[PDB]
């Protein structure tokens, strides 16, 4: 089912210029005769896209990173380019995504696949008997525990001229976003110098973690043809986009790039008049990230505060000092379940990055109805006569039911 037909002939990695390519509609809004701006994830202009060529069998597809989203372009004349596979380990023990273009249909699967090292489609009969043209998917060797399934009308495979197909993928908050365009190019060897919008195709509800990907080629003893594809990577960029007198985007410019485009952008115009203009101050980007915490080895007494055998009365509540210990509260996940947990002055999602000064723990036992009275600015007998919280309170309140330890028959 798997056959890796590779040849150990490495290959010097080529590069080429994507001048102004890869501009999509970053919304579903309609607009005419305007110059809208937008910070997003875009492909920056005059960038260094990597050129993969399928001619290298004479007398070749690797797994590539998926840093933040990619731009993908295919020339070719027939349809030697089928879908892609995306994931983080391209193995079992983790789910993965598969987009393939069989015949007369486009299928999409999320599952636990066991892809080959050189997955390909093998098609042979397009001539013989000119009928059947049986195929052969040598993609994976096991596919089980699938979650999503999609079979729809196929991708841009209608219709000398090469067919430039452009795609943009990005994985955001558990969705997969694919934008695409198809253009009948005439100039050989490279992506053209025009300007095309990328109308969106699909938004798949996937929810898997993607770091790497790979592309799947249709081979026709397997011969490969001489098409090519291009891969570029996305960065967070701010774009100035004008549309047209009837929707459809004619042009856009990318500030961060150059000192002139900054002025074109801040002017909100495509033309600059003779003169001298002030731009932003000279910025330097940080190269590294460092963390410096004190030398602390012990763990905090999570088991003699939350797992104690006897608590105090609320009128004579107990106060304990805590110091010199790492506050890794995840150890409370197996043995404790709290019905109330609320912090004031800090966010619960930030507690793991911080460092705390003058830590005290007050413990007592109350009725179930009075837990609402442990909060700043409350009234009632517990808050009036027994235990009062300051209005400028910083810290958390934790409470859990203990009917199994503090009640007798």
């Amino acid at each position: 089912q798997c056959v890796n037909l590779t040849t150990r002939t490495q290959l010097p990695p080529a590069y080429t210029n994507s001048f102004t390519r890869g501009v999509y509609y970053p919304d579903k809004v309609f607009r005419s005769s305007v110059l809208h701006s937008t910070q997003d994830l875009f492909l920056p202009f005059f960038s260094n896209v990597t050129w993969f060529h399928a001619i290298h069998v004479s007398g070749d597809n690797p797994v590539l990173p998926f840093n933040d989203g990619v731009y993908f372009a295919s020339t070719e004349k027939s349809n030697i380019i089928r879908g892609w596979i995306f994931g983080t380990t391209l193995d079992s023990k983790t789910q993965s995504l598969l987009i393939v273009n069989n015949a007369t249909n486009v299928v999409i699967k999320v599952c636990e696949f066991q892809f080959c090292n050189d997955p390909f489609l093998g098609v042979y009969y397009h001539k013989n008997n000119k009928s059947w043209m049986e195929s052969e998917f040598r993609v994976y060797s096991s596919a089980n525990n699938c979650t999503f399934e999609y079979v729809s009308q196929p991708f841009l495979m209608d219709l000398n001229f090469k067919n430039l197909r452009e795609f943009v993928f990005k994985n955001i908050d558990g969705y997969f976003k694919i934008y695409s365009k198809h253009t009948p190019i005439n100039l050989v060897r490279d992506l053209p110098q025009g300007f095309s919008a990328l109308e969106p195709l699909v938004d798949l509800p996937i929810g898997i973690n993607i770091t790497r990907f790979q592309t799947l080629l249709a081979l026709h003893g397997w011969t490969a043809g001489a098409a090519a594809y291009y891969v570029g990577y996305l960065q967070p960029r701010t774009f100035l986009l004008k549309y047209n007198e009837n929707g459809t985007i004619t042009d856009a410019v990318d500030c961060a790039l150059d000192p002139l485009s900054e002025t074109k952008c801040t002017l909100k115009s495509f033309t600059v008049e003779k003169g001298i203009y002030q731009t932003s101050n000279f910025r330097v980007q940080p190269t590294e990230s460092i963390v410096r915490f004190p030398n602390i080895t012990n763990l905090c007494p999570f088991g003699e505060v939350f797992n104690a055998t006897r608590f105090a009365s609320v009128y004579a509540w107990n106060r304990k000092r805590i110091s010199n210990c790492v506050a890794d509260y995840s150890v409370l996940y197996n043995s404790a379940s709290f019905s109330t947990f609320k912090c004031y002055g800090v966010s619960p999602t930030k507690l793991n990055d911080l460092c705390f000064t003058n830590v005290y723990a007050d413990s007592f036992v109350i009725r179930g109805d009075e837990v609402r009275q442990i909060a700043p600015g409350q009234t009632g007998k517990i808050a009036d006569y027994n235990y009062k919280l300051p209005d400028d309170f910083t810290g958390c309140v934790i409470a859990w039911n203990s009917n199994n330890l503090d009640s007798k028959v």
């Epitope: 089912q1 798997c2 393939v100 069989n102 299928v107 599952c111 998917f137 060797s141 096991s142 089980n144």
Partner: antibody, heavy 126, light 108 residues
């Protein structure tokens, strides 16, 4: 889950015929080769028959060719053996097995003979 | 067709030690090999499906190594549920042909 059951076995005097049936549940039956596999008592495993989807490609064993006939029904999800002119060396436990996975489509499972039946005993004795 | 040969063929061992089974082939099969286990009275079940990959629900003491020919299954730290008869099957070309089995006995 996914399952294969058989029926039809028993005891047959030699020179007569029998028909084994096998019913599947939980697959896409048109995406897999099916197979019949015997096991003689006190011996090892040995394939008897293989059939592809739509019954075009059919493999028999050299010990059994010209006497046994496979058939499929993809609508009824069923597999057959018509066993004609039985002999005393056909006393065996028979198994329905799926191992196909049919390399033209996008199937599921593993590549191999992962799911099996439970066995049906055929005894030939005058 | 494609014939397979398993070399140990009634191997005997103690409990908690290493066990090797070798299975050869008469053509070039790439990685299409499965290892099957049959306890007496039951149906066989798959353990390794592409000469090195366990199935879901198989303990991680079985090991598969493979090439064009000369495949190997290894059981380290034997346990008393692992005493059965082990077959090797090729998945490369139809009809799919079995090996011969290897019963594994308990020392005494």
């Amino acid at each position: 889950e996914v399952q294969l059951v058989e029926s039809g076995g028993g005891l047959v005097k030699p020179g007569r015929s029998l028909r084994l049936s096998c019913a599947a549940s939980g697959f896409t039956f048109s995406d897999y080769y099916m197979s019949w596999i015997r096991q003689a008592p006190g011996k090892g495993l040995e394939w008897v028959s293989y059939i592809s989807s739509s019954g075009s490609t059919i493999y028999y064993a050299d010990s059994v060719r010209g006497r046994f006939t496979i058939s499929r029904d993809n609508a009824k999800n069923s597999l057959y053996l018509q066993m004609n002119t039985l002999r005393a060396e056909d006393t065996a436990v028979y198994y329905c097995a799926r191992g196909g996975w049919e390399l033209r489509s996008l199937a599921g499972g593993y590549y191999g003979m992962d799911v099996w039946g439970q066995g049906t005993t055929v005894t030939v004795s005058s | 067709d494609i014939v397979m040969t398993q070399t140990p063929f009634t191997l005997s061992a103690s409990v908690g030690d290493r066990v090797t089974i070798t299975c050869r082939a008469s053509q070039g099969i790439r990685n299409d090999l499965g290892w099957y286990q049959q306890k007496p009275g039951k149906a066989p079940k798959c353990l390794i499906y592409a000469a090195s990959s366990l199935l879901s629900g198989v303990p991680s003491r079985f090991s598969g190594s493979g090439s064009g020919t000369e495949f190997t299954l290894t059981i380290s730290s034997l346990q008393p549920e692992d005493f059965a008869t082990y077959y090797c099957l090729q998945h490369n070309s139809y009809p799919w042909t079995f090996g011969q089995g290897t019963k594994l006995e308990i020392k005494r």
